[PDB]
Design an enzyme around this catalytic site. Structure first.
Site, PDB file in Angstrom:
ATOM      1  N   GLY B 170     -16.075  -1.858 -18.660  1.00 50.70           N
ATOM      2  CA  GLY B 170     -16.182  -2.661 -17.469  1.00 50.70           C
ATOM      3  C   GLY B 170     -16.557  -4.098 -17.768  1.00 50.70           C
ATOM      4  O   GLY B 170     -16.303  -4.643 -18.848  1.00 50.70           O
ATOM      5  N   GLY B 405      -0.193 -31.712 -43.564  1.00 46.91           N
ATOM      6  CA  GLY B 405      -1.135 -31.912 -42.478  1.00 46.91           C
ATOM      7  C   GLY B 405      -2.400 -31.102 -42.639  1.00 46.91           C
ATOM      8  O   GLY B 405      -3.434 -31.441 -42.059  1.00 46.91           O
ATOM      9  N   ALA B 406      -2.346 -30.042 -43.447  1.00 43.40           N
ATOM     10  CA  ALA B 406      -3.528 -29.235 -43.716  1.00 43.40           C
ATOM     11  C   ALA B 406      -4.628 -30.037 -44.390  1.00 43.40           C
ATOM     12  O   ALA B 406      -5.793 -29.655 -44.301  1.00 43.40           O
ATOM     13  CB  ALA B 406      -3.153 -28.035 -44.575  1.00 43.40           C
TER      14      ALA B 406
END
Ligand SMILES: *C(=O)CCCC[C@@H]1SC[C@@H]2NC(=O)N[C@@H]21
Lengths: 91, 507
Positions: B170, B405-406
């Site tokens: 829940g 780009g890393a």
């Protein structure tokens, strides 16, 4: 050393202060053989290890006083870590 | 019966909880009770329980009967200390109405959250529930709303740690999503919205409890749980040690603790970890362990997104966060999963003034339609943002590759970094020499000579360093000492940033 007991005692000390980590080494075997009663007396044959360890190498066997010392050291070191964990900078 | 006798009986009932037979079931099941768990978690004698005499006010469906009046109403709440440091805790008690959430249940939790925010103390929750108490109806939904509001308000103010030690279903499943770290217990804890009964009713697929929401799934495949521990006792022992890393509030500096490990020792073991052969992988963890104080490292999500490593450690007594690539897995390439784990860790450490150390070795991004269709562009921006936004000290070491780009994503100096060191094997480029020469020299004669010339000039750390991309090129053996020095002088660093109502991370 100057005598047979001095060289053997110094060897025992060097082995316990000799740090090898990253691989499996054979210090446990060397440390027990040099302290064996037959080795200190000299009753050594070329098949010595085969009769002392007929079922393989098992490791050093502790006696009553040595177990109590190991338990006292392990317990005191455990607490020493627990006390160090409580010492913070003052906030 | 006198007033004092009634009080004593109310105390004994609250301590028993749901009854001895239900406790017996919990122990048969290999679980501790809620009160036993607190005794393990907190310093002996430091726990003070609040509101032990609170009962539900629901009178419908027979809930007015004396047989349903359990003092404590299924939660243990209160405050204590771990190693002398103040902490607020609560633990859900499964033996009373199944641990379900009532109106009053949520209340008691909310009150200690309000104190923790007021004084600046962390909150640790031990969760175990079956969901809402349907006998009250909509009061339990208001309960969830009030808890959710506190969990959001506390973010960035006090750290919130959640350990799940049982089932969770829940609305309860969303509080760990609002806290900072979530831990689980292997083969004992579950985390799911609906049970297998609903899944089979909706869609024609078969699944069991361990498959739908087990600890192994959430630590290995969904990336929800940060770490699972073998059992209840080990989980709380590791939780105490984890607690010792974190500040009590975001107004506090990163904790500094007595340390015996000299800050200026050399680490010769580092010089030969990184191979000279570009297609030979190595284990980044060997570098992390050799740098950190006393070789203690707390690894987060060891089994999820293995191509990036994040965790906590201490250098010269001060807590730091460590992020780095793992070339052993997928060549050290970034993907969706690694970006998600990285951004979340970095964001927490920045909010609570914990310095960052980055170990970069990244050849680019994982190619393919599996990543492009998954939104690799959107998810990669999460890690870039998380570093660019940071205002805490950032020390980066580049061990071997940083292509494309890393380079900037993995906390380059151009994102307001403080120091950036390169090892002699570091290479910073838009792409490798083979791709670059084929594109630059297209249709020309004697390309092989151009290939040799390009490699000799650019396949090293120099074209970046001579431009100001790297502050120094250091022998690996000196890395630890160099980092320790930076940490002890950047700790008082403050920066200004324009006013914003709130951040807008790409999500
Ligand atoms: C062979 O040509 C495949 C090249 C892949 C090399 C790695 S994988 C991820 C990075 N992206 C890229 O274009 N190169 C890097």
């Amino acid at each position: 050393g100057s005598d047979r007991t001095e060289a053997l005692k110094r060897m025992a000390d060097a082995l316990d202060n000799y740090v090898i980590r990253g691989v499996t080494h054979n210090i446990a075997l060397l440390r027990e053989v040099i302290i064996n009663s037959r080795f200190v007396k000299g009753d050594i044959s070329t098949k010595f290890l085969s009769d002392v360890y007929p079922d393989g190498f098992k490791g050093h066997m502790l006696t009553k006083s040595e177990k109590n010392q190991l338990l006292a050291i392990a317990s005191s070191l455990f607490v020493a870590f627990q006390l160090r964990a409580q010492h913070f900078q003052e906030n | 019966t006198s007033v004092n006798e009634r009080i004593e009986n109310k105390r004994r009932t609250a301590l028993l909880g749901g009854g001895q037979r239900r406790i017996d079931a919990q122990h048969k099941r290999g679980k501790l009770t809620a009160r036993e768990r607190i005794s393990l978690l907190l310093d002996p004698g430091s726990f003070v329980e609040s509101d032990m005499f609170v009962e539900h006010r629901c009178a419908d469906f027979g809930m007015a009967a004396d047989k349903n009046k359990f003092p404590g109403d299924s939660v243990v709440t209160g405050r204590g200390r771990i190693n002398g440091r103040l902490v607020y805790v609560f633990s859900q008690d499964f033996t009373v109405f199944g641990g379900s959430l009532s109106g009053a249940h949520a209340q008691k939790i909310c009150k200690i959250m309000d104190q923790a925010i007021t004084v600046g103390a962390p909150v640790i929750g031990l969760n175990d529930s079956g969901g809402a108490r349907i006998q009250e109806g909509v009061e339990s939904l208001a309960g969830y709303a009030d808890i959710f509001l506190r969990n959001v308000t506390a973010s960035g103010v006090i750290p919130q740690i959640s350990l799940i030690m049982g089932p969770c279903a829940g609305g309860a499943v969303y509080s760990p999503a609002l806290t900072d770290f979530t831990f689980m217990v292997k083969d004992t804890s579950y985390l799911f919205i609906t049970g297998p009964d609903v899944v089979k009713s909706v869609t024609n697929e078969d699944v069991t409890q361990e498959e739908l929401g087990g600890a192994k799934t959430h630590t290995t495949m969904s990336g929800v749980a940060h770490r699972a521990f073998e059992n209840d006792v080990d989980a709380l022992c590791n939780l105490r040690d984890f607690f010792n890393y974190l500040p009590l509030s975001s107004q506090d500096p990163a904790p500094v603790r007595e340390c015996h490990d000299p800050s200026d020792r050399l680490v010769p073991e580092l010089d030969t970890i990184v191979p000279l052969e570009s297609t030979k992988a190595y284990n980044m963890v060997d570098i992390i362990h050799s740098v950190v104080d006393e070789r203690e490292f707390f690894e987060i999500m060891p089994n999820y997104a293995k191509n990036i490593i994040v965790g906590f450690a201490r250098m010269n007594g001060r807590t730091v966060g460590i992020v780095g690539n793992q070339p052993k897995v997928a060549s050290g390439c970034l993907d969706i999963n690694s970006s998600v784990k990285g951004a979340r860790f970095v964001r927490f450490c920045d909010a609570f003034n914990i310095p960052l150390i980055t170990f970069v070795d990244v050849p680019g991004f994982l190619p393919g339609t599996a990543q492009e269709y998954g939104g690799i562009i959107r998810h990669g921006a999460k890690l870039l943002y998380a570093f660019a936004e940071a205002t805490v000290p950032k020390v980066t070491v580049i061990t071997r590759k940083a292509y494309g780009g890393a380079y900037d994503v993995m906390s380059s100096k151009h994102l307001c970094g403080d120091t950036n060191y390169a090892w002699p094997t570091a290479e910073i480029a838009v792409m490798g020499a083979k791709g670059a020469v084929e594109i630059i020299f297209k249709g020309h004669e004697n390309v092989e000579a151009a290939q040799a010339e390009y490699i000799e000039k650019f396949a090293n750390p120099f074209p970046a360093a001579v431009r100001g991309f790297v502050d120094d090129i250091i022998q690996p053996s000196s890395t630890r000492a160099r980092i320790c020095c930076d940490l002890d002088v950047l700790a008082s660093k403050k920066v200004q940033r324009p006013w914003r109502k709130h951040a807008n991370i790409p999500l």
